A paper describes a structure:
Btk is critical for the generation of calcium flux in response to receptor activation, because it activates phospholipase C-γ2 (PLC-γ2), which produces the second messengers diaceylglycerol (DAG) and inositol (1,4,5)-trisphosphate (IP3). The Tec family kinases have a lipid-interaction module attached to the N terminus of a Src-like module (i.e., concatenation of an SH3 domain, an SH2 domain and a tyrosine kinase domain). The lipid-interaction module of the Tec kinases is an extended plekstrin homology (PH) domain fused to a Tec homology (TH) domain.
We determined the structure of a construct of mouse Btk spanning residues 214 to 659, which starts just before the SH3 domain and ends at the C terminus of full-length Btk. The structure resembles those described previously for autoinhibited, Src-like, non-receptor tyrosine kinases, with the SH2-kinase linker sandwiched between the SH3 domain and the small domain of the kinase (the N lobe of the kinase). The crystal structure has two molecules of Btk in the asymmetric unit, intertwined as a domain-swapped dimer in which each SH2 domain has pieces from two molecules. The domain-swapped SH2 domain packs against the large domain of the kinase (the C lobe of the kinase), but Btk lacks a Src-like C-terminal tail to stabilize this interaction. When compared with the other autoinhibited SH3-SH2-kinase structures (c-Src, Hck, c-Abl), the conserved features of the SH3/linker interaction in Btk are the polyproline type-II helix conformation adopted by residues 383–387 in the SH2-kinase linker, including the proline at position 385, and the overall hydrophobic character of the peptide-binding pocket on the SH3 domain. Diffuse electron density for the SH2 domain at every stage of our structure determination shows that this part of the polypeptide chain occupies a range of positions and adopts multiple local conformations. The unphosphorylated activation loop of Btk folds into the mouth of the catalytic cleft, blocking part of the substrate-binding site, and helix αC lies at the margin of the N lobe, preventing formation of a Glu-Lys salt bridge conserved in all catalytically active protein kinases. Glu 445, which would buttress Lys 430 in the active conformation, interacts instead with Arg 544 and Tyr 545. Leu 390 of the linker (corresponding to Trp 260 in c-Src) is sandwiched between residues Trp 421 and Tyr 461 in the kinase domain. The structure just described demonstrates that the SH3-SH2 domain in a Tec-family member can assemble into a regulatory clamp, just as it does in other Src-like kinases.
Residue numbers in the entry:
A (entry chain A), B (entry chain A): 214 to 295, 301 to 308, 315 to 322, 329 to 337, 344 to 657
The structure:
């Protein structure tokens, strides 16, 4: 069929009339191959004759041809011969530097790569050369709504909020302590203002401890901006969450999210609970009703610690008619022993709330019924939207022994893990 | 001591008179650090005030700052947002391509490298960018005396050599068969011309088998160019070796080489013996006296097979007074059984010759004495210039059992191995 092509490695002047002249670099076609050291070839012009089979290589870009390459010339010999002057040998690329020689083994690639000290250096490189990537880095992707974080206070050193700077724009809700209205502070920044009905809380004890809660800053943690004592009944001012509480969101705003966003809702809360855990600050009543959702769908936890200052015994007492029994572990129901682990238990139930899109935990049971059955070993079943792995996480929160339950550090790790899928 | 420097990740307008204005990208100096969410900072202008500690990063080029970076935005979310448009996330570089997204894990380096299909591609790349190498490839190293290989014949299809084309330039030596003169063929190419005294060889048998030896081409193999029958006594024409035989070179040309070049002398011969082995062609009398050295110090083997056609019984007979007893294994001395293994044995002795700079093997002993002692188990001691590893190689050639001796393939491998050091 087709003729085998070769390249002349060396010049060859014909020694007689049988010979064909070879010119280095030029290409020739074999008419007759053989174990013999002479082959019958054809010039690129059509001229024919015999050429030394050792003076030629095979068809595509072989190696003996180019400048550098030096077969089996030892490392020592290559060093004697050898800024940036190089050669390749049996592979290995040897280079002269300042005087010294650097050797790089070729396995086609060296072995190592560009060793950048920082990510920005890496990015700067591939913005100039694709060097192995699918395309040169050309355009960094945007974030239409960047949004700055929350400041621990509305300016430095201001717990007191002057209601002259508060414009009551819209009523939004009606929390357990009073009417939650929405407004701008100094007619610029959005702020949620929560009325506290008199008698609801022991103001003196609460407000003094709000000073601490002020200095609790975290991106997934509904920022407490301040309070006002002059205007009574009082008013705690907090970060504005445009989509209201998570429970109502899970139930009445289902068109606003996909089931693949649920795990992220858990992650958001978990990041927040890790923070409160690190500050050894117990939330005391973690539940979907106490998480809020902002304009961008981010879930943040609110009303953390707030139950310590509720005067209504029916909320505080573990035997009370409105106590969060359905979110409470056995140790809280039996001996009112709150701890990080009680928050973790609550989180498990909160995870369940999220994945059942806001269904009431143990909805068939009474609070005392739930208490008894939990204590026996009744655990919330897997919601349909929760995968085996996700359920394993929320279930771990419900271990009857407190110290055997994960930490929010651990849970956060586990959640980011399945998010990968 | 020195003030801690930071960069503003976001703008911050002062909300009151305690606050210091932050401008994204600009740098600020901390006067007071703290677990509190507000830090006391200093403008690059000297202005002071409090800034949100969450609005700033630490001193050197952190990460949240640049365009791309997106913290913990899952692979799926990054895909929805995302030719060559990119972002970096927790690391991983995600890139848009044509539409599809390619993900590269950053461990700072990706994981892989430029994957070239050929060495010439590799070299072409680093000639433009040093990309991790000590310097960009700039200048390929030279080879002053390149020199073309040997052609199996002086032109295609010419065993017969017309002595009218031969210019007898200089006498050189005086081989066992006759005077070796040096000359140019057609007053151009250098050629060695070896006179064959009449009666020395059985010409008819030899010359006919020289036709085969003609088509034995190898770079470390003294090329047999041709013969002439018309002029008698005859004349075999061969490749010209300017430095004569290796034995005399090892003894009288010691100023011309270093001991580090010895292993290369062995390698050269071994490459040649591998070739003759592959062509199942026995050398029959391998020894330093039968190797030649060219102008560039390269050692090549000559007179291969030639002993089959020597008429003098005292050379051929294993009991003869001039038989190569000192280079012969037991099986050759006892039963005249030549094979590849007999050549390997000879090579071992040749290695010894080289590393004792041409000393006579068993010089104290007579040929019959050597024969007896070899047969008992006397082996040549390690010469001082031979390392333990080199000696191990030449020693392997001397195993009393033939089939237990290495092949020239194996030996070649072993020699290139210690050459590395
Ligand atoms: Au107020
Ligand atoms: Au149930
Ligand atoms: Au002649
Ligand atoms: Au000895």
């Amino acid at each position: 069929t087709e003729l085998k092509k070769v390249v002349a490695l060396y010049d060859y002047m014909p020694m007689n009339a049988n010979d064909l002249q070879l010119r280095k670099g030029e290409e020739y076609f074999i008419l007759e191959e053989s174990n013999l050291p002479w082959w019958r070839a054809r010039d690129k012009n059509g001229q024919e004759g015999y050429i030394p089979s050792n003076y030629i290589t095979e068809a595509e870009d072989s190696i003996e041809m180019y400048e550098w390459y030096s077969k089996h010339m030892t490392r020592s010999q290559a060093e004697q011969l050898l800024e940036g002057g190089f050669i390749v040998r049996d592979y290995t690329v040897s280079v002269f530097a300042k005087g010294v020689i650097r050797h790089y083994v070729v396995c086609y690639y060296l072995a190592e790569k560009h060793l950048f000290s920082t990510i920005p250096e890496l990015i700067n490189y591939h913005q100039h050369n694709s060097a192995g990537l699918i395309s040169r880095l050309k355009y960094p992707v945007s974030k239409q709504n960047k949004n700055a974080p929350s400041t621990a206070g509305l300016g430095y050193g201001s717990w007191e909020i002057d209601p002259k700077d508060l414009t009551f724009l819209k009523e939004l809700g009606t929390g357990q302590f009073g009417v939650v209205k929405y407004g701008k502070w100094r007619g610029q920044y959005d702020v949620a203002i929560k009325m506290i009905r008199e008698g609801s809380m022991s103001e003196d004890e609460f407000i003094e401890e709000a000073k601490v809660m002020m200095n609790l800053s975290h991106e997934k943690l509904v920022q407490l901006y301040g309070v006002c004592t002059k205007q009574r009944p009082i008013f705690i001012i907090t970060e504005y969450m445009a989509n209201g509480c998570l429970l109502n969101y899970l139930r009445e705003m289902r068109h606003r999210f996909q089931t693949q966003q649920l795990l992220e809702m858990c992650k958001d809360v978990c990041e927040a609970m890790e923070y409160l855990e690190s500050k050894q600050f117990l939330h005391r009543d973690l539940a979907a009703r106490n998480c809020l959702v902002n304009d961008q769908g981010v879930v943040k936890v609110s009303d953390f610690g707030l139950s310590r200052y509720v005067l209504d015994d029916e909320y505080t007492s573990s035997v009370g008619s409105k106590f969060p029994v359905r979110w409470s572990p056995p140790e809280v129901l039996m001996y009112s022993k709150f701890s990080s682990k009680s928050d973790i238990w609550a989180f498990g139930v909160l995870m369940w709330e999220i994945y059942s899109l806001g269904k009431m935990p143990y909805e068939r049971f009474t609070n005392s019924e739930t208490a008894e059955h939990i204590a026996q070993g009744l655990r919330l079943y897997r919601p349909h939207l929760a995968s085996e792995r996700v359920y394993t996480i929320m279930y771990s929160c419900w271990h009857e022994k407190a110290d055997e339950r994960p930490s929010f550090k651990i849970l956060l790790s586990n959640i980011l893990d399945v998010m990968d899928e």
